[PDB]
Design a binder for these strands. Sequence first.
DNA 1: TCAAAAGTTGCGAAGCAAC
Lengths: 166, 1471
Amino acid sequence: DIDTLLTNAGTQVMESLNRRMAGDQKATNVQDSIDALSETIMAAALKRESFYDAVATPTGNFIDRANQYVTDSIERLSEAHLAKLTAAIASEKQGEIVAQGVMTAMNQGKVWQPFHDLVNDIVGRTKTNANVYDLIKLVKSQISQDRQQFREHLPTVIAGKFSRKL
Amino acid sequence: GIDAVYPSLVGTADSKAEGIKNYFKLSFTLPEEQKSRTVGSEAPLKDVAQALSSRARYELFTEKETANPAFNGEVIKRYKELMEHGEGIADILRSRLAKFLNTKDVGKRFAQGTEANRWVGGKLLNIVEQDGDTFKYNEQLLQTAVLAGLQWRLTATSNTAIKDAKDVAAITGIDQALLPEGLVEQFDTGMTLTEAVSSLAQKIESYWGLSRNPNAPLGYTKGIPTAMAAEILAAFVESTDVVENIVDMSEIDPDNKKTIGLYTITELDSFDPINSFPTAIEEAVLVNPTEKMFFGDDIPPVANTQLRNPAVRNTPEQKAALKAEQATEFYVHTPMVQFYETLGKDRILELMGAGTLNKELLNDNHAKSLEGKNRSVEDSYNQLFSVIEQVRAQSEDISTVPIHYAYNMTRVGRMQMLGKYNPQSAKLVREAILPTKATLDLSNQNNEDFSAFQLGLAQALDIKVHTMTREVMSDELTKLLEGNLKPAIDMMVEFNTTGSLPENAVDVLNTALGDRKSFVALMALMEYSRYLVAEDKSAFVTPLYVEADGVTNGPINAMMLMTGGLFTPDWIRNIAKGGLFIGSPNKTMNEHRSTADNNDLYQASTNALMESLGKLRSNYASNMPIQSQIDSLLSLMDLFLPDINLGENGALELKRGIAKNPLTITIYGSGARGIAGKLVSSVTDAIYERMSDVLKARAKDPNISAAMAMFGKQAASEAHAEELLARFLKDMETLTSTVPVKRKGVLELQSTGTGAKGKINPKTYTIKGEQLKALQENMLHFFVEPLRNGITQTVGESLVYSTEQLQKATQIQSVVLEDMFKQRVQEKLAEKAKDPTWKKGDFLTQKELNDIQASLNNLAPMIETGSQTFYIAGSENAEVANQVLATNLDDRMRVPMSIYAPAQAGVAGIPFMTIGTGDGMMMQTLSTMKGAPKNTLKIFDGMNIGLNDITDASRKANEAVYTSWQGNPIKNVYESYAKFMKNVDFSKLSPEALEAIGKSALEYDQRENATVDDIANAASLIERNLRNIALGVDIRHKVLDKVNLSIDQMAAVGAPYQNNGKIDLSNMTPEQQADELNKLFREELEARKQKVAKVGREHKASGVRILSATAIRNLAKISNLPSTQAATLAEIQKSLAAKDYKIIYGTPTQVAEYARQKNVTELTSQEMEEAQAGNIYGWTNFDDKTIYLVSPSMETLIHELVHASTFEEVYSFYQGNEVSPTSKQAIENLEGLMEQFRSLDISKDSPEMREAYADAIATIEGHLSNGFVDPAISKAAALNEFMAWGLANRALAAKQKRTSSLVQMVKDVYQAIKKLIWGRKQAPALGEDMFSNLLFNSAILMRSQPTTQAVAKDGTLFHSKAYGNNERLSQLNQTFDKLVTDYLRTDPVTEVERRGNVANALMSATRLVRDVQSHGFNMTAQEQSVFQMVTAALATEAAIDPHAMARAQELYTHVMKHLTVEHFMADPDST
DNA sequence: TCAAAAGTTGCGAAGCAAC
């Protein structure tokens, strides 16, 4: 086929160059030319290494990887009930409850009560003995809880009502 | 008892008498119980005739309530014909006896009173009867004997083993790497003399129902049945039941005068009713039959001894695993047996094998190789359908009859099914009989039970399900089910409804499956097609399974059980590829392979192979012919062997668990020459297959040229195919005409005749003889040697050291046992020489043999691990007797004498421990652990689990792996070697025995004139080395148990096991985790050691002291050294102060603690051996000019001040900077002395001096043979090590030494350093102390930029959903690396403007690459990189050769003539 | 290389010769 003829016509060109580098490079003064080729390969090798380790997440997201690095870096320096509530909001299957919006659903589940306790300590309304690093690990913990339940678990619920694979 | 029954035997029952003797009445006794039903039968042949006449008749004789339902009236007629045939042989045997009695008047000689019953061939006569002038057989013994022959006739081939390479070579006399092809296959039908007679002899003895007297000669309790067995086989071969083939071996090679013989047994027809119930005779004449099939409540017994090792018993822990495995019930898959029989046997052979066979269009050497593939499938197919016939007769529904199998420990502790063709071994029966079952709800395609269903389908269709997430697997599987596999599924659906297949069923599957063809791929198609037509998907019942295969189970187990010393960051990364994760809870292999690393151990070794190969090729830049030879060998590999990672991945071969990959083979102690022949055999086999395609293409078109017929599929034009053919011809000619030779450490080429010429003749093309030998010589020197260097780098140096000591310890102990065993039989035989009753030709009694065997118990020949027992030296040799056991009546076939005696171990010690304790223990632990999984089929390193509990039984598989990793093979071996040396004496061994053990203990130069004192001393050193290794392994296993770990070794689902540690090692670099593990390692050492015993600014967090520059003025003259050397310190220190050198010192605990706080790499020199001595050495960081000392003193401080200054001259000189003329000569002179350092003789030096030279030469050559480091850095390191050896050994080589060359070498190197330090000014006289015995002992740390090939090959196999998972693009990059990347210069890349002609093309191509991506062609990260690199290669080549693009232009104009805008529009009528 | 082993006849009655 034409596509199979095109790839074969490419390796022929590469094999012609391979028989040139395997000879006496210094005598046949191709030493300078090959050095230019090696620079291009080196530059492209480092670029593809940067894109990797930038999506080193199970979800493969730019934001998700960045949050994990910051979270781990805080634990080095520093030397439950609400999570279950947010899981039920994103796992609703009634059909009519989800049609009333998310503001109504949050009020019914009393999600605002665990949230109020944490913010009061940060502002200073309620005095507490917890240090700064304990509170930072709390706010950043609930942020990742919302993303996991809504950006990853909610689409699975919607697709689960179909008896097929669209 | 014995005398009471058949008392008419000729002879006197008295023990000692002058008359004739009947030795049968003394050799065999009468068992108190009942073993055979024919003991009291006057006519055994007729007595069983009335037993096999009707179902009712068979009931009484067997003493059973009911008989097997398969024993119906149809097979009754068949047994009458066979047993009548078994009545004609009994008359043949009687006729042969009469001829022997009259030939050469042998019977007449008995009339005088000659002892003719004691001859080699007269042992048969011991059971004859007296009738006057002539003799006759005893009817009861004769008729019972032929019953064993009939039973042996039916099931002989079903139990014969498979001949191995060594035995085939042993009986041939030529190595299997050099013998002509085809003769190996002849083992499939024929069996040697010993195999036939030994198997038949056992049945005859068992059927007689008599025991053996322990006080009788071994020539009668073992020779009488053998003489009887040889007579039946001789009767059968003349009765056309057995055909004898005599092979003349002088044709293949004239020097082989041996004339071997093969015996083949005629086979019954496939549809013969006897195949249904072939064991009627065996279960009628015996009480506890061994040949049986267990149905329902029948349970196989438990073996009491190992397989072919009666001296070793099964441990109670081992016996528990046998009970569990044999209790698992199997079932037959009805929908699969219908598919097999409808397709037909002939169609199966064409589909699975190489299609239809015709000698006209097949190569001669290729055709004979395909016979083995066809033979295995035909035999496995026939065996499977013989079992089904018996099962179908037991119940109305075939899928409700349980079947039980039998297991037994092998010689390495692995469970093994009994039988040649079983679900464990044969892959054809694996798809028909399964123990797995499941019930799933598939009514919804988004359920959780549907993901498990897709996992089984994807894995069976050759998809790496263990390297991708559960979402990528579904995406890739659905493409196949709607693409190439669509036509195959449609036919399958039709079969499930009407039960018919098209006439082109074989052709359709070949097109669809492609290279994914397997016996399990046909089951996946059946299950998927059965699911579509099902009307109720809520209760689907399927036997589909998923295999939890281990990831490189061989090297990983050996690396974790036989490694000692401190932890290393490289070891941490390498062990991650096996499934051991440190500081990462709830981690799986799928996450590791997708986000961390996609390179495995096999790929890592190959990457290091090319790194070292490029270094070797660069060393011969001045020898062009040598380089061209290297390219020719590599070019030939690319054409026919794209990959070197072999294995047991074939679909037409039985699974035996033997590892054949080069990586695991090299670990197991195989020789370099042996693996060279194996690699050549793969290349030659690939060449022959291409010849068959040329002949096949010729028939279709008789006008195609040779080039187009061979390289048609990879040619872009007719001229391109000519270049490939011409290149191949030149490559094969050079390799077979020139060979490399090793001269004084450097290779050279020599001519060895003429190679292949310019003539193909594909019908009769072969390579053998001188040409074949020349091929392996090139392979060994150019590919095998770099392979060994690459393998050692990845698996760790310390692992290689632990294996070498294990092999030497087991080899030495085996030779002593063998020699001592042979020295006691000769003494016993000589003792019996004065007994008139004893006659030469017999042997020792069973009781006597046991006493000799029991006399070696003090030498500890067995290794105990607490639950397993190993006997390495045990074997059934034959040279210890050097006699003839028995023979045929006409003296046609002579059977030698074989005894169970210890033999030489060789190199079998390494694989015995790794397999026995590494993988063998895991399966044993898995069966007997609490809550063990049920209904599973574990073969050797995998397991088949039902789809219902994939995530639960896989978790317990990883738990067993963790438990099996707590063992210590070295400690068990050392506990036996230590006892062996306590009760040994080397002064009583045979002279040849001392030579055998001298080849392992001593070196090459010290082998000659080896005194018995040197042998004893050398053997004692190995025991000491084993003690330290067992201590290091024990401590390491203790430290790893105190940290959190995740184990995902044997899994593919993603259910790891957690070791519930307590020390958190997360959020740390792999370099950082090593320091924490080392801290716990050192605390364990001092805890045990204490049990046996029962100036500058100071840092704040640690007690170390910092002595910066401009603060050492006072200490200059504090040492009160002489003014001749005192002035040197002022100058040397002045230069150091200008470079801002800092000094840090303290106790080992303080100096190590400070490094962890400031993230400083430490290189302290201390180990377990050094801990006892109590010596600690610091290190120097050359990057930031920092000197570290541990527990310093005034003397060692001065040594390091001049050590740092001296190394600067060495480093600067090798970096290209100018050096003073006085210093230039000194380094140049030292370089010259280095070239003579590695070419010295040491055999005449002190034993301690040998170790100093051996250690120095090991590291010196390692630096020079490194291809991934800067040449300037590597050269400086090698010279620094040379200086250290000379100064360290000066103190003890300056006394009690002779005028040896090595001793002289120390003086020359010491003088060279003196001039370098002092320069042109006056130096102290010769023989004077330099700086109070100055030594160099601190290591130096250096770093440099990596090479281009290091970073390009790292990201070749990157794949992820967000990064790009195009499989085809990964393969294209791999071929790009071979052609272009591997041939770049090893020097690190630089940055210059680089004006010229080629750079303009490269710069322009980069801009055009970007414009394509931004103008409608959006590409991922993976696709962008490949497109960028490939285009660069085509850009520079087109810039040099203007005609390189001539062909590509022609294809471009044709494409442009058929292109339209609507081609790129997904919906052509969009709005 | 991680596994069972392993020439065939003639004379003469064990073991060398011949191939």
